[PDB]
Scaffold this active site. Structure first.
Site, short mmCIF file in Angstrom:
data_model
loop_
_atom_site.label_atom_id
_atom_site.label_comp_id
_atom_site.label_asym_id
_atom_site.label_seq_id
_atom_site.Cartn_x
_atom_site.Cartn_y
_atom_site.Cartn_z
N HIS A 226 0.82 -1.23 0.00
CA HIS A 226 0.00 0.00 0.00
C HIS A 226 0.83 1.25 0.00
O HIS A 226 0.40 2.27 -0.65
CB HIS A 226 -0.92 -0.03 1.17
N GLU A 227 1.85 1.25 0.86
CA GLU A 227 2.70 2.43 1.05
C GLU A 227 3.54 2.64 -0.22
O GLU A 227 3.70 3.75 -0.56
CB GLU A 227 3.56 2.38 2.33
N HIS B 56 2.00 4.38 -2.82
CA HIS B 56 2.08 5.82 -2.45
C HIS B 56 3.40 6.39 -2.98
O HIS B 56 3.35 7.45 -3.64
CB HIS B 56 1.96 5.99 -0.93
N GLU C 149 -6.32 7.79 -1.26
CA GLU C 149 -6.43 6.51 -0.56
C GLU C 149 -7.38 5.58 -1.30
O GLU C 149 -7.19 4.39 -1.18
CB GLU C 149 -6.94 6.74 0.87
C1 LIG Z 1 -0.01 1.66 5.39
C2 LIG Z 1 -1.03 0.97 4.63
C3 LIG Z 1 -2.33 1.74 4.74
C4 LIG Z 1 -2.47 2.91 5.26
N1 LIG Z 1 -3.47 2.91 6.43
C5 LIG Z 1 -3.56 3.78 7.48
O1 LIG Z 1 -2.65 4.53 7.76
C6 LIG Z 1 -4.80 3.57 8.60
N2 LIG Z 1 -5.06 2.24 8.30
S1 LIG Z 1 -6.88 2.15 7.68
O2 LIG Z 1 -7.26 3.40 7.20
O3 LIG Z 1 -6.97 1.08 6.82
C7 LIG Z 1 -7.88 2.06 9.17
C8 LIG Z 1 -9.23 1.74 8.93
C9 LIG Z 1 -10.12 1.60 9.99
CL1 LIG Z 1 -11.89 1.40 9.73
C10 LIG Z 1 -9.61 1.64 11.27
C11 LIG Z 1 -8.26 1.89 11.48
CL2 LIG Z 1 -7.41 1.81 12.84
C12 LIG Z 1 -7.37 1.99 10.39
C13 LIG Z 1 -4.49 3.95 9.98
C14 LIG Z 1 -3.26 3.42 10.51
C15 LIG Z 1 -4.51 5.27 10.27
C16 LIG Z 1 -3.81 5.92 11.31
C17 LIG Z 1 -2.54 4.07 4.35
O4 LIG Z 1 -3.38 4.15 3.53
N3 LIG Z 1 -1.60 5.14 4.56
O5 LIG Z 1 -1.58 6.27 3.54
ZN LIG Z 2 -2.57 5.55 2.26
#
Ligand SMILES: CCC[C@H](NC(=O)[C@@H](NS(=O)(=O)c1cc(Cl)cc(Cl)c1)[C@@H](C)CC)C(=O)NO
Ligand SMILES: [Zn+2]
EC number: 3.4.24.69
Length: 398
Positions: free
Chosen positions: A208-209, A212, A243
């Site tokens: 995922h990253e 990015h 995202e």
């Molecule tokens: C690194 C891979 C994915 C990533 N996900 C996230 O950071 C979140 N993951 S998430 O959005 O999928 C998410 C969804 C839900 Cl419903 C609940 C949480 Cl804890 C996290 C949280 C860690 C946010 C702080 C991302 O898209 N970064 O740009």
């Molecule tokens: Zn992301």
């Protein structure tokens, strides 16, 4: 990816095992060059942001499963070496896929643009797209990089892809690109469901990253303030355009096509403006490389076309295929297909747990199958990713 196997202990050589200084904007850290233009820092990220390295938590944390805060994680060499091994496995696991191999190829080839001079005939590196690599005499040598995998900051599960900015320039949104500094750990993973069912294959999280680093390196990243549609459950959060591109799948339909049209053209004219800057280039700054070597680098990045004069153009076709590849082929959803794993089918699957993991041993998790080891009980119904069935490899935390 990684040609040689690396140990954290392994002596500094000033080439691919070095002490390094990040664009600030301080003390040197041991970093490994696991491939052209890709370095790994087996440290916690207390460097990229202004004093955002106290490890200690603030007032009220989101607690598990939205936050985790161990001040002591990635303090020990033994952890640091496991970290490196950990990221050196996920990369390969990523590389083993025809898609990951292409993506990484995209990332490596996506040199940030030498857009640093005030004079518009001059090609000059943006120092923020460099690191300083400490030489024997304690002197530093400006080095160009694409992507840094570094440890998490305070919130250990706060994985992100970030980048140093410019006084005027939006480097991730103007086709230039910027060195990426992904803050990640393969020593934890998130649990989801569809009783606590399963766990994310960290390979996917890292993929995922990298999707990015992809868009940000090619300067085609959607502005973070572009959020979207209200197709609410039968009073709700919203998700970023950026995202939504990146996860992909079904949810990559919520996006107004005539907002995607409106971007797919925005980054064409941006690319075209790059082609112009190069054509209008008469000088280059630096010792390193010639204005011609660097013009070919970027010819190679932006898949520009070279006529007999050697004037560059943006082929609308090569661009569309590149843009399609980075934006809509390179998605978390399409990775989960290739990996033959289970993952949240959407971005509305509130990971209800962070689990401690160790993906390093080939009995725990391997390049080819992840957790879901073949010739085992785990290779079916993703019983490898089941937190219950495979309780050794998944230990829920606070
Ligand atoms: C690194 C891979 C994915 C990533 N996900 C996230 O950071 C979140 N993951 S998430 O959005 O999928 C998410 C969804 C839900 Cl419903 C609940 C949480 Cl804890 C996290 C949280 C860690 C946010 C702080 C991302 O898209 N970064 O740009
Ligand atoms: Zn992301």
């Amino acid at each position: 990816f990684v040609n040689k196997q690396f140990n954290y202990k392994d002596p500094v050589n000033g080439v691919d095992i070095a002490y390094i200084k990040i664009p600030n904007v301080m003390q040197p850290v041991k970093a490994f060059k696991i491939h052209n233009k890709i370095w790994v820092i087996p440290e916690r990220d207390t460097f990229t942001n202004p004093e955002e390295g106290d490890l200690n938590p603030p007032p009220e944390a989101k607690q598990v499963p939205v936050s985790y805060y161990d001040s002591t994680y990635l303090s020990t060499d033994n952890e640091k070496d496991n970290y490196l091994k950990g990221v050196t496995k996920l990369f390969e696991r990523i590389y083993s896929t025809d898609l990951g191999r292409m993506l990484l190829t995209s990332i490596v080839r996506g040199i940030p643009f030498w857009g640093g001079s005030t004079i518009d005939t001059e090609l000059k590196v943006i120092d923020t797209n460099c690191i300083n690599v400490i030489q024997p005499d304690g002197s530093y040598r400006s080095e160009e990089l694409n992507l840094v995998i570094i440890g998490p900051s305070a919130d250990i599960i706060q994985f992100e892809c970030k980048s140093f900015g410019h006084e005027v320039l939006n480097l991730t949104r103007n086709g230039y690109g910027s060195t990426q500094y992904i803050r990640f750990s393969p020593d934890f993973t998130f649990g989801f469901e569809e009783a606590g069912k399963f766990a994310t294959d960290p390979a996917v999280t890292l993929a995922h990253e990298l999707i990015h680093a992809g868009h940000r390196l090619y300067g085609i990243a959607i502005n973070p303030n572009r959020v979207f549609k209200v197709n609410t459950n039968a009073s709700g959060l919203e998700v970023s355009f950026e995202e939504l591109r990146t996860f992909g799948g079904h949810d990559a339909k919520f996006i107004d096509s005539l907002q995607e049209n409106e971007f797919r053209l925005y980054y064409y004219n941006k690319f075209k403006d790059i082609a112009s800057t190069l054509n209008k280039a008469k000088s280059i700054v630096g010792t390193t490389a010639s204005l011609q070597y660097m013009k070919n680098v970027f010819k190679e990045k932006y898949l520009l076309s070279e006529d007999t004069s050697g004037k560059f153009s943006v082929d609308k076709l090569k661009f569309d295929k590149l843009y399609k590849m980075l934006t809509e082929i390179y998605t978390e959803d399409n990775f989960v297909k290739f990996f033959k794993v289970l993952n949240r089918k959407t971005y509305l699957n509130f990971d209800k747990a962070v689990f401690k993991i160790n993906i390093v041993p080939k009995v725990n998790y391997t390049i080819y199958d992840g957790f879901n080891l073949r010739n085992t009980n785990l290779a079916a119904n993703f019983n490898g990713q089941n937190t219950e069935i495979n309780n050794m490899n998944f230990t829920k935390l606070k």
